[PDB]
């Protein structure tokens, strides 16, 4: 019955910087506060507990504070290694509740996407599943949308995507969505799109192919 | 070096089951709270179970109450998850963690965790049948004897009914038990015998009921 | 390691019939053995229990009987509801080993199948798979042996089989065995064909088709 | 009155991992050895495991041995069996036993059975990929369509490793089918397309498949 609640959900810097990530209870629960860092695929990592004491071997240059509802963890000196996700916790004798935690990037220019559309390989096709492929190359920030469109009409659930990790020499993300039919509802419509939102587009940017052609 | 690790997951329709267990290394669970927690799509964390030292009490978030189950096993060092009536929004890598630290006390944090395993739900709960014919042989023996029927290909879940012309065929007619395909969907096959002087003038149709999809299909069956 | 052998492995009967199923154990465990029964896809149901010993609620025309090696499962006046398999048990505090089990049927005259052979159908082959289903019609007793053959060529893998209960009014079994390719591997061949052996028969019968007729 | 209902059975492919539970109805678990039977598909039983009360006792069948692992719950009524490695020969219906008598003593027979649960380990352990080609448009970007594998991972490189800059290689995805699937892609000059060759080497290491697909233009 304690909601906790971090700020910002992204936090954007360059190594070397000194950042501060907040975290707020709804009610006061002391120093009963943990910090955990956490990289995509990988298990959290425990920093800090009781609110500011540092879990043997983190790095010094972690440091928590707070109490009551307000609460904060301070990084003197983001190096590369540091950027991730990292979340608060409020921790009781039984259960326990977390943020929605704060992802950490690095700092660059916004870039727009280089959009490309794929139909489905002849191959694919005559074993009865259609799946087309929209890419979104080098764009900055993460945050993006895709939409299908099939002779324009909205597409949902039969779609998947995944998204890169920043790339290390120009630190931007690259995304790849499926949107996957059978060949039976592939061959009744003929306009296949894709449509693009992104922070470095002043509008949005779609791809098309006409099936057949 | 401590660890933990899951087993068991993988994909489940919705609505289905699935049970996850988690073992450890270089520690005794026993002393330990254990607790499990899943990371969303969205990145978030969401706690979802605990568990206290010798089972006194068994603590649930409010999206998994009545339908998630904790126990512990102190002896050989497991902890196991039954996840029941399963939801789309349980999708997530699921985490076995240990609350915990360098000395132990009413209220520490999560000090090791396991790596993950992967846990999807899809949002069908259930798919129709698609109905083929069984078209009887052109080169029957001429005078009687002839073989058609029906196959229920790609169903789920069981079961499926079926009758021949609405129930007016009954002598000769075989409902087969359906077999598990490796798609994980169900197949089974109906078939009767028939004159084959009858073909041409008797119209027969197979009436397929899947009533855990609510889908009817009557298929009309013909030489050729 | 205990090791239980049952005798016979099929037992065909009349209704009325006073048969024996026997156990026999490798070496002596006294009188710890108990019989179940068991109906096809239901659990099952313990009948005896220290070798002679009746559960409450089973009926009386069960008895068991045997110590040391040699144990007997007696049934005095079958009734249509026993027809079933039944499985002896060596149980120990900690462990347990069952025989093979014996099922039980009801006793008729020679049948053998009436075979037919069925293509695939043009609306499912446009869709990419190739099911070929063989059907064994009216035969007894149940055991019979299905091999496809593409261009005769042995298949190995690629079909399942399911079998019918016993039929009400003559008695007999039916089997279908379906044969699943891709639109691809059912197309690179011409000839196909079930052979179906069976006591019934003198000589293995050979039902097949050419691909389009 | 009494009854036993078991949960999680399902498809696993060989060498995976699959867990079963067993819950009751209208008695205690605490005061029996709880059991798991399996039914093999040529219609015997086979005896699997056996947890006596306070699990002083954990006893396996020679053939799962070192596999599976059976625990119990005595406060919520639960029993549990961890299926590892798993094999072909493991598929059977899985059936939870109690062993009791209206009077219990030592060693009483297996008085109460569930209805079971059916468990069915494909052959296959893993599955070399399809590699269909992501045709650049009539810097142009191809790519690989690397589709239904498993397990993971595979590796992707491009011209034998000869060709780095502006390559991209997905995290897989696990489609419904249970298989994995990703695509590599790499940008290029608009001008090379008809001048430079370009092939994904595609290798799958717990397939021991490898395959080389040429892109070109159309």
């Known amino acids: 019955d304690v909601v906790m609640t971090q700020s910002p959900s992204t936090l954007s810097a360059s190594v070397g910087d000194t950042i501060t990530i907040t975290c707020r209870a709804s009610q006061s629960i002391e120093t009963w506060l943990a910090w955990y860092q956490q990289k995509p695929g990988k298990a959290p990592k425990l920093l800090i507990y009781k609110a500011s004491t540092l879990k043997t071997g983190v790095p010094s240059r972690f440091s928590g504070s707070g109490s009551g509802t307000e609460f904060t963890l301070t990084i003197s000196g983001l190096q590369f290694d540091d950027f991730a996700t990292y979340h608060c916790?409020?921790?009781?004798?039984?259960?326990?509740?977390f943020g929605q935690g704060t992802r950490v990037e690095i700092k660059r220019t916004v870039a727009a996407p280089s959009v490309f559309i794929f139909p489905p390989s002849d191959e694919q096709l005559k074993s009865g599943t259609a799946s087309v492929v929209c890419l979104l190359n080098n764009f900055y920030p993460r945050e993006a949308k895709v939409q299908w469109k099939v002779d324009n009409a909205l597409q949902s659930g039969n779609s998947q995507e995944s998204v890169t990790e920043q790339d290390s020499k120009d630190s931007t993300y690259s995304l790849s969505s499926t949107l996957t039919l059978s060949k039976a509802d592939y061959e009744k419509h003929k306009v296949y799109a894709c449509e693009v939102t992104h922070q470095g587009l002043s509008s949005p940017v779609t791809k098309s192919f006409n099936r057949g052609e | 070096e401590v660890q933990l690790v899951e087993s068991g997951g993988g994909l489940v329709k919705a609505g289905g089951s699935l049970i996850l267990s988690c073992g450890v290394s270089n520690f005794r669970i026993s002393a330990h709270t254990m607790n499990w927690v899943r990371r969303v799509p969205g990145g978030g964390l969401e706690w979802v179970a605990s568990?206290?030292?010798?089972?006194?009490?068994?603590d649930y978030a409010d999206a998994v109450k009545g339908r998630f189950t904790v126990s512990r096993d102190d002896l050989e060092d497991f902890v196991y998850l039954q996840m029941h009536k399963m939801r789309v929004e349980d999708t997530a890598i699921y985490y076995c963690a240990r609350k915990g630290s360098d000395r132990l006390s009413d209220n520490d944090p999560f000090d090791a965790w396991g790596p993950g395993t992967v846990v999807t739900v899809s949002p069908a709960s259930t798919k129709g049948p698609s109905v083929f014919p069984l078209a009887p042989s052109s080169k029957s023996t001429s005078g009687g004897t002839a073989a058609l029927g029906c196959l229920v290909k790609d169903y789920f879940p069981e079961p499926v009914t079926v009758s021949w012309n609405s129930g007016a065929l009954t002598s000769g007619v075989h409902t087969f038990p359906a077999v598990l395909q490796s798609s994980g969907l169900y197949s089974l096959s109906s078939v009767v015998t028939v004159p084959s002087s009858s073909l041409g003038t008797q119209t027969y149709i197979c009436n397929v009921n899947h009533k855990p999809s609510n889908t009817k299909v009557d298929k009309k069956v013909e030489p050729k | 390691d205990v090791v239980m052998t049952q005798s016979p492995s099929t037992l065909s009967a009349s209704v009325g019939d006073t048969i024996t199923i026997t156990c026999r154990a490798s070496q002596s465990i006294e009188t710890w053995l108990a019989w179940y029964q068991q109906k096809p896809g239901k659990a099952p149901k313990l009948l005896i229990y220290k070798a002679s010993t009746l559960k409450t609620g089973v009926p009386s025309r069960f008895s068991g009987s045997g110590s040391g090696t040699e144990f007997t499962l007696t049934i005095s006046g079958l009734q249509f509801d026993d027809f079933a398999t039944?499985?002896?048990?060596?149980?120990?505090?900690?462990?347990?080993?069952?025989?093979?089990g014996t099922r039980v049927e009801i006793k008729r005259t020679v049948a053998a199948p009436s075979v037919f052979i069925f293509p695939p159908s043009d609306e499912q082959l446009k869709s990419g798979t190739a099911s070929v289903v063989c059907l064994l019609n009216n035969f007894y007793p149940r055991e019979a042996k299905v091999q496809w053959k593409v261009d005769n060529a042995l298949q190995s893998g690629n079909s399942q089989e399911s079998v019918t209960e016993q039929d009400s009014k003559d008695s007999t079994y039916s089997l279908s065995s379906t044969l699943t390719l891709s639109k691809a591997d059912y197309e690179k061949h011409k000839v196909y064909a079930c052979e179906v052996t069976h006591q019934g028969l003198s000589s293995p019968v050979t039902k097949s088709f050419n691909r389009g007729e | 009155e009494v009854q036993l209902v078991e949960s999680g059975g399902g498809l696993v492919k060989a060498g995976g991992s699959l867990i079963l539970s067993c819950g009751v109805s209208n008695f205690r678990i605490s005061a029996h050895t709880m059991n798991w039977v399996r039914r093999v598909p040529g219609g015997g039983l086979e005896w699997?495991?056996?947890?006596?009360?306070?699990?002083?006792?954990?006893?396996?069948?020679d053939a799962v041995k070192g596999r599976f692992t059976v625990s119990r719950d005595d406060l919520e009524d639960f029993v549990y069996l961890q299926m590892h490695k798993m094999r072909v020969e493991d598929t059977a219906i899985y059936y939870c036993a109690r062993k009791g008598s209206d009077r219990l003593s030592d060693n009483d027979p297996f008085d109460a059975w569930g209805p079971g649960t059916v468990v069915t380990v494909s052959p296959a352990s893993t599955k070399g990929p399809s590699v269909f080609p992501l045709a650049p448009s009539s810097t142009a970007a191809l790519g690989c369509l690397v589709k239904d594998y498993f397990p993971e991972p595979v590796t992707v490189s491009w011209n034998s490793g000869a060709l780095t800059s502006g390559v991209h290689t997905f995290p897989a995805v696990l489609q419904s089918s249970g298989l994995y699937s990703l695509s590599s892609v790499v940008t290029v000059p608009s001008s090379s397309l008809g001048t430079q060759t370009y092939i994904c080497n595609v290798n799958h290491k717990p397939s021991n498949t490898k395959v080389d697909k040429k892109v070109e233009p159309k």
């Open positions: 916790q409020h921790y009781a004798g039984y259960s326990a509740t």
């Open positions: 568990i206290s030292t010798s089972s006194t009490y068994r």
